[PDB]
């Protein structure tokens, strides 16, 4: 019952790497993905066994996490681990993108996603939810391939480098660099997706890390 295989498959998917079957999943993951540990506060890489680090476990350990204050806790995740794992996508020795795990509360469930970000630290190349428990046909449509496709090319930050992603009720404008369509008939799940990015792009999330990525830190 190791569903770390589904997690590896989802990381490969959002990275744009086609893999079919459990054997090919592991082989391509080992060839092309480099898990790394990141200190959230500084954005620096840290030493440690990134492949076996359990961020969910750390997030509830007194010595490994912090309680978020009510004002900080935009995504309603209650606590944040000190250290997170990210997944570098490798093309030879070059890093072509970085996959970030994010999570936040929906209407019924804690929703966990991977977001693939280019080496400008701003442009999204892929999004996939890998654990969510919203209602099938309503909030569960965060898994719809057409909704995920809308994220490609969107920018996380504006030119003041402040978080700018918006989940737009009724649908985003055609020209929008920052707007993504909300889920029709499921506004409350949609607000949870919004809150997830509000937290994870800010100062208590991957904000510091994505500043380092922007300034050339992955190559
Ligand atoms: Br966390």
Distance CA 71, CA 48 (A): 31
What is the arrangement of strands in the sheet containing 110-118, beginning at the earlier edge strand?
A: 45-46, 33-39, 83-91, 94-105, 110-118, 124-131
CA of 108 to the centre of ligand 1 (A): 19
Gap from CA of 63 to ligand 1 centroid (Å): 13
**Span from the CA of 2 to the centroid of ligand 1 (angstroms):** 21
3-state secondary structure string across 127-161 = EEEEECCCCCCCHHHHHCHHHHHCCCCCECECCCC
Q: How far, in Å, is the centroid of ligand 1 from the Cα of 81?
A: 4
CA 85 / ligand 1 centre spacing (Å): 9
Nearest to 33 by CA among 95, 84, 83, 112: 95
Domain boundaries, the chain: 1-219
- Structure solved using which method? X-ray
Instruction: Let me know: does 167 contact 186? Beta carbons within 8 Å.
Output: no
User: Distance between CA 173 and CA 179 in Å, rounded?
Assistant: 7
Instruction: State in Å: Cα 137 to ligand 1 middle.
Output: 28
């Amino acid at each position: 019952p190791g569903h770390l295989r589904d997690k590896q498959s989802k990381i490969l998917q959002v990275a744009g790497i086609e893999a079919k079957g459990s054997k090919q999943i592991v082989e391509l993951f080992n060839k092309s993905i480099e898990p790394r540990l990141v200190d959230f506060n500084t954005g620096d890489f840290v030493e440690g066994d990134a492949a076996n680090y359990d961020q969910r476990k750390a997030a509830k350990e007194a010595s490994e996490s912090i309680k978020l204050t009510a004002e900080q806790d935009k995504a309603k995740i209650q606590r944040r681990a000190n250290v997170g794992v990210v997944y570098l996508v490798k093309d030879g020795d070059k890093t072509s993108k970085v996959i970030l795990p994010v999570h936040g509360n929906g209407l019924w469930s804690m929703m966990y996603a991977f977001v693939a970000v280019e080496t400008d630290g701003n442009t999204v190349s892929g999004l996939t939810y890998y654990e969510q428990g919203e209602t099938p046909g309503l909030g569960g449509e965060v898994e719809n391939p057409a909704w995920r496709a809308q994220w490609v090319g969107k920018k996380l930050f504006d030119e003041n480098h402040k978080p700018a992603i918006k989940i737009v009720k009724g649908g985003a404008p055609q020209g929008s660099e920052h707007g993504v369509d909300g889920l029709s008939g499921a506004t409350l799940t949609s607000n949870g997706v919004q809150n997830t990015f509000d937290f994870w792009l800010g100062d208590m999330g991957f904000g510091p890390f994505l500043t380092k990525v922007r300034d050339g830190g992955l190559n």
